[PDB]
Design a binder for this molecule. Structure first.
Ligand code: FAD
Ligand code: FAD
Ligand code: NAP
Ligand code: NAP
Ligand code: CL
Ligand code: CL
Lengths: 443, 443
């Protein structure tokens, strides 16, 4: 009895870890094969200089850029089964850079020795369900041998993410503009925009942070523009918020303001689409980015075919944490530990969650909702319960720190909820930590 | 009886045109469906500002950039069945810009009324051959309805090109460099590199022309580097050729010279790979870019499954011309007008062509080879024969003009081989024609 895991990001890693933990406690687990299109694990967190299409011609997966740092409290994403203390030996600050959290998540799966289940440099092409044999045929392309083969599986868990395929709206005049146009996804070294004016379309995390990053590394000027509401923070002297872009010139941008500016480069921070080109409509999740996509029982079991699962397909306040709660749940249903109700009951449950999701107005209500969801997940499972209300509170502080000063929210520290140890302040304040390396952050 | 044509570029267009011509002459043709992922036809020639992944999340197909102009004599790519005179009403110069040749190729298929066979905004996902029914199942994703469906076909003609999936080699230090790194494929407006130093890796057409374009629109400095041999032309004052790049710094490039330069942006002009993610190994052509890929009988019929065809998969001296000769051939075999020999005879014939291909040393020998190939194709077919030796000679002149001056080769003019009418000189010399529009070129 055999399981396919699509992707070796945090969720892929989590799913392997879940099975490995059940085996460590002495259960008999199914056989596992995890397919990954990259040469190494970590999903988003595996940095690449590459852009658009990778060396094999697959879409480039990582949206991460130089100088990226955790954008929420470390302690809100700590593994309940593998603490920051265990991995690093010492306390560290609360907003580690990319390389640092990369090392962290790799650490857990290194210790667990699950790498052996992964076939790297292998792209998933197709997943089909065979009614007659009640199994899945997974077709993949191995770019090391340049071969396309397929295998049979009893269950499939999809962990391929939903922040990689850019949503890139068109604006009148883009075909005439003379500077670079790119999506947030293709943003790499902030230095390429030193001494330049940068338009940033959009009003969410990518806008906030890519702006910040351009500012931090010496851009002349920054302009955000928003579809519905303005971001709201107090931006430095050389950064304006204007209502939405409307058209574009050989060298200028034009807003619903009626205003005008010379612009060097436009970065579309307009989000991503859920895109699964390896799935047919019988298995393919279709949703906008949100806290409660429909058709997932407990947010992970595919309602039309419960032998297929999805991990981390929700919008994220929590992350690593959540994927774990999900992977532990998925594994337990795969292992027969948690039998599924009938299809009608699944559908009714999911509707109840959706109703509640529509109730949400404030940031606080939103992550508390994710919190309740995770709470419901971890109570069903092996997975160590931890203080969710206390994690909610940490998000609340984090929100405040951003409102106080959007350029110094990374300079604060919070209490781990696994160990209790409060985090030190970091040796360099954010604006001045120009070196982004593990090396430089840990010394 | 039903045919699938994958792609509506020049080759897709040609294939439709071939069938339509046979019907015009009163034959009964099969049913046709052509699938195209873009919103309009023209293949490479359909310009987009987009980069990496398109609005639906498909790889962006076009490699074409602002200010692109035909890089060979117009008269070497003229349709034998739809002349430049017929389309434009008047003579024009010999190196029309993108928009101009786009209008031209669209013209022929507009006149033919074949648009009706095309399902746009539809990406081909998979082609499978069913041994039992001796038919193909083609699975596509319609991005207008967001639906994935599949249809049965008796033959399939693949026209999806091989200059879209970039070959992008890695160079030590790319992960540290602070300026933009891109493939020729993502190159759009030359203005983004005004007053900048641009490294261009590679020594072929893309290197030549992207360099030229950067120069023409005011780049500070240009550096080409070559893997095997230097391009050879006399570059302007602010452009050097040096041997291959070896590593890269925060802001510098280092070559096998031992030399060093501050660099603002690197453009990889390292070519493309034949990539068919919608085919399994039974149907998937695997080759490097060359005049004679193996496994194609007469360079178009797939030897392991002769109900599957490939158009325009060869490296190109000739182009539009050749695709026609190929499409007409493909159609005549589909229509039963040209029965195929046994598999052993096919294999033997292809070997003879390969042997001769390996003989080739000089540019002249190379396009003369393609010429002999095309000659062999058009003699079997309906397709109007035209003067190939005379077209060869035109390539020869073209070669000379490039050797004389690589910046003014586009300023000469040549004799059409269809009509005999010599082409006028163009109202503006190349270096000065800053406006790239149809509008501005034809007035
Ligand atoms: C720019 C950016 C910054 C972020 N920063 C933070 C942060 O600071 N803190 C936080 O908590 N969260 C952050 N996130 C949220 C992020 O979603 C999670 O941290 C985490 O990366 C989710 O991991 P995942 O495994 O579920 O998906 P991913 O990390 O995207 O991994 C999916 C994996 O599937 C693979 N894959 C996809 N398709 C195929 C295929 N066809 N065949 C084979 N393999 C395939 C990919 O290669 C990848 O390895 C950020 C996201 C982005 C995009
Ligand atoms: C930058 C550049 C400049 C060039 N300049 C010249 C020139 O000046 N003169 C010249 O003679 N030749 C030139 N060429 C050569 C070029 O190969 C031909 O002119 C011509 O474009 C070949 O057309 P094609 O139909 O065979 O392939 P393409 O033009 O690439 O068209 C292929 C079609 O297939 C579609 N497609 C691909 N995959 C899918 C899918 N999965 N599902 C649905 N549709 C799909 C694409 O959208 C596209 O429309 C140039 C090529 C490039 C890249
Ligand atoms: N660690 C980091 O520093 C970091 C950096 C970048 C990203 N991230 C992560 O990446 C994920 C998503 O980031 P995201 O901000 O790119 O996607 P997102 O969270 O879904 O934000 C989508 C944004 O794009 C805007 N938008 C969409 N279409 C638009 C249009 N046509 N015109 C103008 N604006 C438009 C939306 O406007 P509306 O609000 O009106 O809908 C919204 O503000 C999050 O998980 C985040 O944690 C993290
Ligand atoms: N109309 C226009 O002006 C225009 C503009 C651009 C492109 N095009 C078209 O696009 C097509 C291909 O253009 P192309 O030049 O990009 O591809 P190409 O013709 O196949 O050229 C490949 C080049 O990349 C070089 N290269 C490969 N790997 C390398 C490496 N690791 N390091 C350094 N160099 C490397 C090769 O070096 P080697 O020589 O040693 O093998 C070769 O010079 C042609 O059909 C051309 O007509 C046209
Ligand atoms: Cl362990
Ligand atoms: Cl006609």
């Amino acid at each position: 009895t055999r399981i396919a895991i699509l992707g070796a990001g945090p969720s892929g890693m989590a799913q392997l870890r879940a099975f490995q933990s059940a085996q460590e406690k002495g259960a008999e687990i199914p056989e596992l094969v995890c397919f990954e299109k990259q040469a190494d694990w970590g999903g988003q967190w595996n940095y690449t200089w590459r852009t658009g299409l990778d060396e094999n011609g697959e879409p480039v997966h990582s949206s991460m850029y130089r100088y990226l740092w955790s954008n929420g409290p470390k302690e809100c994403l700590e593994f309940a089964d593998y603490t920051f203390d265990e991995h690093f030996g010492k306390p560290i600050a609360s907003y580690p850079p990319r390389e640092v959290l990369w090392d962290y998540i790799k650490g857990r799966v290194e210790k667990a020795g699950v790498r052996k289940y992964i076939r790297f440099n292998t792209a998933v092409r197709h997943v089909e369900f065979n009614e007659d044999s009640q199994t899945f045929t997974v077709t993949v392309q191995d770019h090391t041998t340049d071969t396309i083969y397929s295998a049979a599986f009893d269950y499939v868990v999809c962990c391929t993410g939903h922040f990689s395929t850019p949503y890139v709206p068109e604006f009148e005049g883009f075909e005439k503009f003379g500077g670079r146009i790119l999506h947030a996804h293709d943003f790499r070294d902030a230095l390429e925009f030193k001494d330049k004016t940068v338009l940033l379309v959009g009003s969410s995390y990518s806008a906030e942070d890519i702006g910040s990053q351009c500012y931090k590394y010496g851009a002349k000027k920054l302009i955000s523009c928003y579809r519905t509401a303005p971001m709201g923070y107090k931006w430095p002297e050389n950064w304006d918020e204007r209502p939405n872009l409307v058209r574009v010139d050989t060298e200028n941008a034009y807003f619903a303001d009626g205003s005008s500016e010379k612009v060097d480069a436009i970065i579309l921070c307009t989000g991503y689409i859920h895109h699964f080109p390896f799935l047919n409509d019988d298995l393919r999740l279709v949703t906008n980015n949100r806290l409660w996509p429909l058709n997932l029982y407990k947010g992970v079991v595919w309602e039309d075919n419960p032998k297929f699962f999805y991990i981390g397909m929700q919008d994220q306040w929590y992350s690593f944490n959540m994927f774990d709660a999900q992977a532990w749940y998925a594994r337990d249903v795969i292992m027969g530990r948690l039998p599924l109700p009938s299809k009608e009951e699944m559908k009714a449950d999911s509707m109840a969650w959706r109703e509640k999701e529509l109730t949400l107005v404030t940031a606080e209500e939103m992550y508390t909702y994710q919190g309740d969801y995770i709470q419901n997940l971890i109570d069903m499972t092996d997975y160590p319960s931890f203080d969710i209300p206390a994690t909610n509170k940490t998000f609340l502080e984090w929100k405040h720190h951003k409102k106080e000063n959007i350029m110094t929210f990374r300079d604060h520290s919070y209490r781990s909820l696994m160990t209790g140890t409060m985090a030190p302040k970091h040796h360099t304040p954010w604006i001045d930590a120009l070196d982004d390396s593990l090396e430089a952050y840990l010394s």
